[PDB]
Amino acid sequence: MEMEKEFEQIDKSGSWAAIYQDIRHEASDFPSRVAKLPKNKNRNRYRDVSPFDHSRIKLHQEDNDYINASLIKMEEAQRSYILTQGPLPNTVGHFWEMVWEQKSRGVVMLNRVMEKGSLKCAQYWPQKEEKEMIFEDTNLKLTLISEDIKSYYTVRQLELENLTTQETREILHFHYTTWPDFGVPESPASFLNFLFKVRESGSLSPEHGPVVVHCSAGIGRSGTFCLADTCLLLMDKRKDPSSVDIKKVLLEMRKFRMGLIQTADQLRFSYLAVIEGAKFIMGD
Ligand SMILES: Cc1cccc(Nc2ncnc3c2cnn3C)c1
Ligand SMILES: Cc1cccc(Nc2ncnc3c2cnn3C)c1
């Protein structure tokens, strides 16, 4: 079926939970043996969210190459993404090592450091220009260059220096600051505006390594971001945009990381975002 009318048919019939459970039943199951080794227990935030072995990102290190991060490679859309958990106190150096080694231009953050009164990820970037951060375990230096605070999101320019080679690179930090502690946003308008700002920066384009995107576990809000982006790109590329099937795209992405889209409310929000986004692209 088309998307917008499949949407109203699920609303009127109140069957979002059944649709979402079907997706969960059909989703791929691949091994995640490296994630479960005892030496990696303090590298995982949640015991039930792990990268598959076949798609995990490997650190260029001979001691321990593990990070909780996955490469989502979308062949028809010609887009790749790295989805990862929010960094932990003992993995902030690994996080920036990955950014460096994978040649990423941008980092997309969809959570606040504290939500619901608890810490959802480490404070992994500097908050003042004159107070830079050094990660001694991976030999990197990170400096805040500039910050632009807007009503729904903040963009930061960061400098990452490999202290071994003295090479430097500019990284863009796109921080969506207004996702509610509970539920999903009422309108997709600010989330779509944010997605378009990431696109306009070059961070999603083939001349760079894959964008790094995270929330707390790296599957819920993060899944919504890449699902909406890929569906909108396919609607631009194909002769028949109504042929784009969001459930099929989501199942393809779940071949590469488990659990993407965590609730039936997040599934409905993803439909809403793609539907509204397709009107703004055109040709409008
Ligand atoms: C606040 C912020 C966030 C992200 C990127 C940038 N970059 C720039 N922002 C404004 N003017 C700029 C540049 C680079 N060159 N020039 C001339 C700034
Ligand atoms: C926030 C951000 C990140 C990355 C790229 C950009 N690009 C620009 N955004 C706005 N005006 C711009 C440019 C480049 N030239 N000029 C004149 C902005």
Swiss-Prot record:
The modification N-acetylmethionine is found at residue 1. The keyword Hydrolase applies. GO terms for biological process: actin cytoskeleton organization; cellular response to angiotensin; cellular response to fibroblast growth factor stimulus; cellular response to hypoxia; cellular response to nerve growth factor stimulus; cellular response to nitric oxide; cellular response to platelet-derived growth factor stimulus; cellular response to unfolded protein. The modification Phosphoserine is found at residues 50, 242-243. Keywords: Acetylation, Endoplasmic reticulum, Hydrolase, Membrane, Oxidation, Phosphoprotein, Protein phosphatase, S-nitrosylation. It is found in: Endoplasmic reticulum membrane. GO terms for cellular component: cytoplasm; cytoplasmic side of endoplasmic reticulum membrane; cytosol; early endosome; endoplasmic reticulum; endosome lumen; glutamatergic synapse; mitochondrial crista. Oxidized on Cys-215; the Cys-SOH formed in response to redox signaling reacts with the alpha-amido of the following residue to form a sulfenamide cross-link, triggering a conformational change that inhibits substrate binding and activity. The active site can be restored by reduction. Ser-50 is the major site of phosphorylation as compared to Ser-242 and Ser-243. Activated by phosphorylation at Ser-50. GO terms for molecular function: cadherin binding; enzyme binding; ephrin receptor binding; insulin receptor binding; non-membrane spanning protein tyrosine phosphatase activity; protein kinase binding; protein phosphatase 2A binding; protein tyrosine phosphatase activity. The keyword Phosphoprotein applies. There is a cross-link at residues 215-216 (N,N-(cysteine-1,S-diyl)serine (Cys-Ser)). The active site is at 215 (phosphocysteine intermediate). The modification Cysteine sulfinic acid (-SO2H) is found at residue 215. Interacts with EPHA3 (phosphorylated); dephosphorylates EPHA3 and may regulate its trafficking and function. Interacts with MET. Interacts with NCK1. Tyrosine-protein phosphatase which acts as a regulator of endoplasmic reticulum unfolded protein response. Mediates dephosphorylation of EIF2AK3/PERK; inactivating the protein kinase activity of EIF2AK3/PERK. May play an important role in CKII- and p60c-src-induced signal transduction cascades. May regulate the EFNA5-EPHA3 signaling pathway which modulates cell reorganization and cell-cell repulsion. May also regulate the hepatocyte growth factor receptor signaling pathway through dephosphorylation of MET. This is Tyrosine-protein phosphatase non-receptor type 1. It comes from Homo sapiens (Human). The chain holds residues 1 to 284 of 435 of the full protein.
